[PDB]
Amino acid sequence: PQAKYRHDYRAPDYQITDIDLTFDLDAQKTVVTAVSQAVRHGASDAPLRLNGEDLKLVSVHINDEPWTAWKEEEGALVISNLPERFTLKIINEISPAANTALEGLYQSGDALCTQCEAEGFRHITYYLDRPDVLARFTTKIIADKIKYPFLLSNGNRVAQGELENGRHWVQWQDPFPKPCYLFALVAGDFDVLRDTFTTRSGREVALELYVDRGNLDRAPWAMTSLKNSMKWDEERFGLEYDLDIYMIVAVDFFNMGAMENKGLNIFNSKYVLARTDTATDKDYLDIERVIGHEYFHNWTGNRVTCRDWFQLSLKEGLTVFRDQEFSSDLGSRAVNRINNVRTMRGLQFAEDASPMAHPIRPDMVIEMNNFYTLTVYEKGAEVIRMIHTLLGEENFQKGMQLYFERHDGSAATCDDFVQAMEDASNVDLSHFRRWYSQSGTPIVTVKDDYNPETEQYTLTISQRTPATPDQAEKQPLHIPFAIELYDNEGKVIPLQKGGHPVNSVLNVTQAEQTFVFDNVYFQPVPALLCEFSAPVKLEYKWSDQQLTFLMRHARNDFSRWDAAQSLLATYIKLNVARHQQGQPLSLPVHVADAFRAVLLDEKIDPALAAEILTLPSVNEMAELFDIIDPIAIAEVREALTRTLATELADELLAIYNANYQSEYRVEHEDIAKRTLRNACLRFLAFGETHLADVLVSKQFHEANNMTDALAALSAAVAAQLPCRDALMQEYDDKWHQNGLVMDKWFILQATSPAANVLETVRGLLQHRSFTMSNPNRIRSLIGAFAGSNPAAFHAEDGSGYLFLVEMLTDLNSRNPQVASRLIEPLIRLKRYDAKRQEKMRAALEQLKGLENLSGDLYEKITKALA
Ligand SMILES: [Zn+2]
């Protein structure tokens, strides 16, 4: 498999302006007829090079003339000696039932559906499968009426008819030119939830949610979220929907989360289906964010698309930023920001420290499906957020407006977007652009000095990004570094110098820089990198008392949580080192007291309290360490939970009881109290056994919603309580028929602290609710084990690696994209001790030698073994 390079971009020799597709649909043999209107832009002697994968070519015509000047080569059909303008007609066959990779046209249960991003359309017909080729699509679908009563594609129905032998057809037209990655087709039998949204300017939009028969009871929340998204994009960004119908189809077999196909989104059912007894608060909020995300792509992705796949973050960074803003505006901004920072620090930083490290705009790609990443998405959003920080909302929106004005109806680049922001705002972003081209996490080091003679406070700030495997050269970035200074009373000290106010967002642009503030009347306690103003590691020599002061006094809820994280970090590091020396947990009294104060503070938002009382995950803890000891980390996490459970037992029970809610509402105040109640339950599960066992089993049995039932079940597993096996069995017996609900149980099994966890996981490969054919099941059992139980995955006998090798040997052939998701924990080998590295290296070498090794895995394995 050959690497492709951003610097090699060249405008296409041919454009296609219009494509008329006909599908004669059948699960075993689908016949595709594609009539494209082409225009040569390149040299008159250039051939037309069409991409295609696993196609049975039937015929090639040019202006209805059977063509003789063509040849098929690996991944391509090369057509020679063409006119400047012509009609290309390709007929080919494909087999949806054989498509286990779930890219192109495939089968999901009894339905047929597509996934075309990034390069799936070439698995359907021979085409210019590159996103800078935009064409107007018409799509005719012919199928068995009984099997496929609904035949959907992008846009509007323009024709329909019936045929002999029980077949029928529907033709769709989408007036907006699009790259083929936004093509979609769905055929099947569905229940349909129908609603309307009327745009601000009065366009009535038909909303249609297609779900498997029997699932209508689980559709209203997704529909509500769609309308919420539509309204918010109008209010916040001034953007309205641009078509007459909006369709969403929920499918059970889907590699990603969801897909923004123009006017016909296709969603993993996980991000659509919810009812109070099947879905948790987190599920509801995830459905809201993913529904919003795909909706927001209508402008940031569809109306303006990507020139090439190296520009993926142009749509993903910006659309993730949009989904975060949507969630934050509608819900708790603090909780959203906290959660997104947990993801950055605990998951994205790990990626940026790995062999797969890449800039948010990659320079080199072998398999583009490998670049739908935490970096491109979440760090992408952090980069957009930094622009927002530097410009402010008003200028940021002017930049959005200029971006659309310039680029609506076209395929654009990351650089185009930055230019629009720069031009609209008059803020210089030339240095800022380096964020697009440099990988790795910057480390920002802060030293301070207070001079009582001059009443001046000085911050000496330095930055460096360690080299990464992809980049030997690193340079200083333009880092927006937000600060606040607090006096002894917790009042904010005005920032000023030389008689003029100074903006609280400092421009840290050099390797080392000095910032001086005057009229600092009292030695300040600083809050640094406020609201995580840049995606960086902060090094500052905090005292415990500075941190607890901030937990008490910081103006932004995020700063209070972040201070708690810095406080915990010190003692997590302390206790991991202790664990390695065979010593038990040590925690100063004043640290437990800080958390007691959070529990007993009447004024604190329950949403914030819940997050402060949620310990960093084992993945967040791992990133505190150069060399990861996953067993020490897991055992310290448990020990810390137990210590706090004991020290805070009375306060935890008081707050647990006080936050009881007899009514279940998916409303933000209710969610906050429930999140706090369940955060308390976590610790209580680790209290005196009988007490804990009664409390947990009672909650599981009395729960009137899945959030509370799952919190109890999770606690029983985490604390290995007596009731665990009974509750797990009850859940299986009640829910085995429901894959999405069973995913929660597979995750619990996979992440169990039980000594026999791997044995149980292996056994579950035969479970009635498990199947290797379904990405969700695979990720919930195998993915969760390898990625979310690093203590068990990294068992010293190497049994975890061997298990993953077995699974990947299957998935490499079945579904390379899911295989590539699942190999990620193995490619982190250099973060581990030498004994583990050698076993992980051995595992990787076994995979490297697989017959028919997918490009997806080849790319990761080669980087990991380098
Ligand atoms: Zn997206």
Side-chain angles (χ1 to χ4, degrees):
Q2 242 43 54
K4 293 186 176 308
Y5 294 93
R6 187 172 60 90
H7 62 237
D8 282 334
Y9 176 82
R10 185 174 76 96
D13 280 336
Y14 291 83
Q15 273 292 350
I16 290 167
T17 62
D18 302 85
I19 177 169
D20 187 285
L21 285 159
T22 302
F23 291 80
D24 200 345
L25 278 185
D26 175 80
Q28 302 308 315
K29 189 180 79 181
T30 290
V31 185
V32 182
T33 304
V35 181
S36 299
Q37 314 302 148
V39 180
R40 180 166 57 233
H41 291 252
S44 56
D45 67 342
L48 190 251
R49 299 183 176 271
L50 299 167
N51 311 290
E53 297 286 349
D54 305 313
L55 307 182
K56 181 178 185 173
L57 223 201
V58 175
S59 60
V60 181
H61 304 241
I62 302 295
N63 298 330
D64 288 325
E65 169 72 354
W67 206 246
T68 56
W70 63 267
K71 70 175 177 191
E72 278 176 307
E73 295 187 303
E74 180 67 33
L77 171 60
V78 180
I79 305 173
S80 292
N81 311 321
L82 294 160
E84 184 176 349
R85 297 164 183 268
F86 54 94
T87 308
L88 169 68
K89 177 181 193 175
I90 295 296
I91 302 176
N92 63 269
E93 299 179 4
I94 61 186
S95 183
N99 194 337
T100 57
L102 316 185
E103 192 176 84
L105 178 62
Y106 68 95
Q107 196 162 36
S108 179
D110 293 321
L112 300 175
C113 59
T114 54
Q115 172 61 30
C116 292
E117 192 185 3
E119 295 167 328
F121 191 74
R122 71 185 65 188
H123 291 256
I124 297 175
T125 191
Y126 279 113
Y127 197 70
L128 291 176
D129 187 7
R130 49 185 294 165
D132 56 348
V133 170
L134 286 67
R136 294 165 292 252
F137 283 64
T138 64
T139 309
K140 180 179 282 172
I141 312 166
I142 308 161
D144 189 82
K145 193 179 167 177
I146 287 167
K147 206 167 290 181
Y148 307 112
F150 296 93
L151 303 177
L152 313 175
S153 188
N154 316 84
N156 294 304
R157 281 180 199 80
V158 294
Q160 47 196 131
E162 300 224 322
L163 302 163
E164 64 181 1
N165 300 312
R167 289 152 86 247
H168 73 145
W169 64 271
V170 181
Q171 190 181 42
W172 294 84
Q173 192 157 29
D174 173 355
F176 288 99
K178 67 166 161 290
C180 60
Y181 81 85
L182 289 169
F183 173 77
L185 179 150
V186 173
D189 186 22
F190 304 98
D191 275 328
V192 190
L193 180 61
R194 304 170 187 277
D195 205 342
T196 58
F197 183 83
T198 303
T199 73
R200 170 178 210 237
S201 68
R203 189 177 205 121
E204 181 180 287
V205 179
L207 314 176
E208 296 172 359
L209 178 53
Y210 293 80
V211 299
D212 283 350
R213 290 296 187 177
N215 281 158
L216 224 40
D217 66 338
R218 290 198 285 174
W221 173 246
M223 182 62 81
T224 302
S225 291
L226 179 57
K227 292 185 286 178
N228 284 344
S229 301
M230 294 177 87
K231 190 64 174 211
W232 178 87
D233 220 3
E234 291 185 344
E235 293 179 0
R236 185 73 186 272
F237 281 78
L239 297 171
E240 289 191 17
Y241 192 55
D242 55 351
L243 284 170
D244 313 275
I245 316 172
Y246 200 103
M247 300 172 277
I248 295 174
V249 182
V251 300
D252 281 354
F253 294 80
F254 201 75
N255 284 336
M256 339 282 154
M259 182 59 212
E260 73 269 22
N261 315 293
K262 184 77 174 194
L264 175 55
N265 293 179
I266 297 169
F267 272 61
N268 190 307
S269 63
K270 80 187 311 289
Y271 294 123
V272 178
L273 307 177
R275 213 168 67 215
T276 65
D277 63 330
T278 65
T280 61
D281 291 333
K282 180 194 153 56
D283 293 326
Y284 277 92
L285 298 180
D286 281 338
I287 289 161
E288 178 181 75
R289 81 183 81 254
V290 175
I291 288 280
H293 184 98
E294 313 307 336
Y295 180 74
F296 306 142
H297 268 309
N298 193 49
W299 285 94
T300 51
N302 299 3
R303 288 287 290 264
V304 186
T305 192
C306 297
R307 190 192 70 176
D308 60 70
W309 291 115
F310 306 95
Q311 320 299 326
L312 181 59
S313 202
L314 173 67
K315 72 185 183 72
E316 299 306 339
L318 184 51
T319 302
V320 170
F321 175 76
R322 280 152 64 55
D323 84 53
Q324 290 181 3
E325 288 300 295
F326 170 58
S327 292
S328 293
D329 278 349
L330 270 61
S332 172
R333 182 163 285 277
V335 169
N336 279 281
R337 191 64 185 140
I338 290 164
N339 278 307
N340 296 328
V341 173
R342 291 189 188 118
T343 293
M344 283 296 301
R345 290 179 178 158
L347 298 178
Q348 195 279 333
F349 282 14
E351 185 168 74
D352 245 339
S354 82
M356 263 293 293
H358 49 285
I360 63 161
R361 178 185 62 201
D363 289 331
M364 171 191 176
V365 170
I366 296 174
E367 173 47 67
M368 187 56 209
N369 282 327
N370 284 338
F371 291 82
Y372 285 74
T373 57
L374 291 154
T375 297
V376 166
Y377 278 65
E378 281 75 23
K379 181 177 172 170
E382 296 300 302
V383 174
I384 302 303
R385 191 172 294 280
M386 279 188 287
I387 298 179
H388 183 271
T389 293
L390 292 169
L391 272 57
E393 175 78 7
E394 183 173 312
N395 279 334
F396 186 90
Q397 296 297 348
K398 296 182 194 285
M400 293 300 301
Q401 289 160 26
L402 187 55
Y403 175 64
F404 296 127
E405 206 158 33
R406 290 180 173 170
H407 305 290
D408 188 359
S410 87
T413 67
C414 294
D415 192 72
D416 290 330
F417 175 80
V418 179
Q419 192 65 239
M421 284 289 171
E422 179 170 75
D423 292 343
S425 69
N426 302 122
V427 176
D428 181 15
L429 300 176
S430 60
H431 188 189
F432 187 84
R433 286 172 171 76
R434 189 165 292 144
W435 282 107
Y436 284 83
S437 55
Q438 183 165 109
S439 56
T441 313
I443 301 167
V444 179
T445 301
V446 177
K447 291 167 168 41
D448 63 357
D449 174 73
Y450 181 67
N451 183 335
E453 292 176 47
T454 57
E455 293 177 288
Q456 289 181 319
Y457 182 66
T458 303
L459 292 179
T460 305
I461 304 184
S462 57
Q463 69 169 293
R464 52 173 288 274
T465 298
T468 53
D470 62 307
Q471 281 184 354
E473 183 207 17
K474 302 291 182 183
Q475 300 190 261
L477 299 165
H478 179 173
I479 300 175
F481 192 86
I483 70 162
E484 301 172 343
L485 306 179
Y486 291 90
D487 68 19
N488 51 305
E489 310 277 274
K491 295 179 181 191
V492 175
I493 300 175
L495 301 178
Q496 51 173 313
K497 207 211 179 311
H500 306 113
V502 163
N503 196 291
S504 68
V505 181
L506 311 180
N507 293 290
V508 170
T509 62
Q510 303 186 249
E512 193 189 277
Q513 217 163 157
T514 274
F515 299 87
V516 182
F517 306 91
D518 296 343
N519 290 252
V520 183
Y521 51 85
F522 197 90
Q523 178 174 319
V525 176
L528 303 169
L529 205 70
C530 297
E531 293 171 82
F532 193 63
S533 70
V536 306
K537 289 159 170 276
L538 177 68
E539 296 179 347
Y540 174 87
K541 201 187 153 188
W542 295 110
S543 73
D544 289 5
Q545 287 181 305
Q546 282 178 315
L547 294 169
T548 60
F549 175 96
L550 291 170
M551 285 170 66
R552 219 167 307 120
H553 293 295
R555 279 200 309 176
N556 200 290
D557 284 5
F558 176 86
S559 292
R560 305 171 75 181
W561 172 84
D562 199 25
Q565 301 316 112
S566 295
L567 185 61
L568 257 6
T570 300
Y571 297 100
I572 291 160
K573 289 187 267 195
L574 179 64
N575 285 298
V576 163
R578 290 178 57 78
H579 182 279
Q580 293 172 336
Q581 302 155 278
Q583 311 171 66
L585 196 100
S586 174
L587 190 75
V589 176
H590 64 263
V591 180
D593 282 342
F595 292 86
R596 194 187 318 275
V598 174
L599 276 165
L600 304 176
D601 187 346
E602 303 197 53
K603 296 181 183 194
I604 194 166
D605 186 346
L608 172 60
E611 302 309 323
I612 293 179
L613 292 163
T614 297
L615 297 181
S617 72
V618 294
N619 292 137
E620 293 177 79
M621 294 173 168
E623 291 313 296
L624 301 171
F625 301 94
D626 293 320
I627 298 303
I628 304 168
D629 185 339
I631 298 178
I633 287 167
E635 295 191 350
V636 166
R637 196 173 190 274
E638 182 172 331
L640 185 54
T641 305
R642 288 188 180 275
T643 296
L644 293 171
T646 304
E647 298 302 317
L648 311 172
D650 295 330
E651 294 87 351
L652 290 159
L653 182 63
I655 296 311
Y656 175 83
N657 288 153
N659 283 281
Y660 172 79
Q661 294 175 283
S662 66
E663 286 280 359
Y664 179 78
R665 306 182 185 88
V666 182
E667 294 172 23
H668 298 289
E669 289 185 21
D670 292 41
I671 293 163
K673 297 170 59 168
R674 184 160 40 253
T675 307
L676 176 60
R677 188 164 187 267
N678 292 147
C680 290
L681 185 65
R682 288 204 194 95
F683 292 104
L684 290 166
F686 282 96
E688 189 275 311
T689 302
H690 180 256
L691 216 172
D693 199 58
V694 173
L695 205 73
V696 166
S697 57
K698 181 173 162 199
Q699 179 168 318
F700 182 82
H701 289 129
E702 296 187 349
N704 70 355
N705 60 273
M706 179 58 87
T707 301
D708 289 337
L710 191 64
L713 189 59
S714 190
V717 174
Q720 303 174 71
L721 298 172
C723 68
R724 185 201 63 206
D725 291 346
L727 305 190
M728 289 295 277
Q729 187 58 54
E730 281 162 40
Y731 187 109
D732 187 353
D733 288 339
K734 183 169 174 180
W735 291 117
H736 65 96
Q737 75 284 162
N738 193 315
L740 292 179
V741 177
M742 291 305 289
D743 285 338
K744 314 178 166 309
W745 186 91
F746 288 129
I747 290 166
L748 286 182
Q749 297 275 209
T751 59
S752 174
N756 67 339
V757 59
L758 179 55
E759 176 180 71
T760 302
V761 167
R762 283 194 175 272
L764 292 175
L765 296 173
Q766 313 307 323
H767 192 278
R768 57 188 177 176
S769 307
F770 183 79
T771 172
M772 289 295 279
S773 69
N774 184 285
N776 291 22
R777 305 302 97 76
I778 294 165
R779 296 173 59 184
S780 300
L781 179 63
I782 301 157
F785 177 79
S788 298
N789 199 340
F793 176 63
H794 288 285
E796 297 210 80
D797 64 5
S799 60
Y801 318 132
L802 298 182
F803 174 65
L804 186 58
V805 169
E806 295 177 37
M807 298 304 96
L808 293 172
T809 298
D810 175 313
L811 295 169
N812 174 73
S813 290
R814 184 192 303 259
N815 185 338
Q817 285 182 76
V818 179
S820 189
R821 293 186 72 78
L822 264 54
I823 204 168
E824 206 73 10
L826 209 47
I827 72 159
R828 306 289 179 75
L829 69 172
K830 279 187 183 66
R831 292 294 297 285
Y832 293 84
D833 61 83
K835 181 192 176 178
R836 288 191 169 102
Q837 288 197 30
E838 279 323 280
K839 299 184 184 288
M840 293 169 81
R841 201 160 262 127
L844 290 162
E845 289 278 5
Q846 176 159 346
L847 295 169
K848 189 181 169 178
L850 286 173
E851 189 190 334
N852 311 130
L853 181 66
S854 64
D856 310 60
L857 292 191
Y858 170 86
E859 180 165 30
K860 298 192 171 176
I861 292 162
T862 59
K863 294 188 197 293
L865 286 176

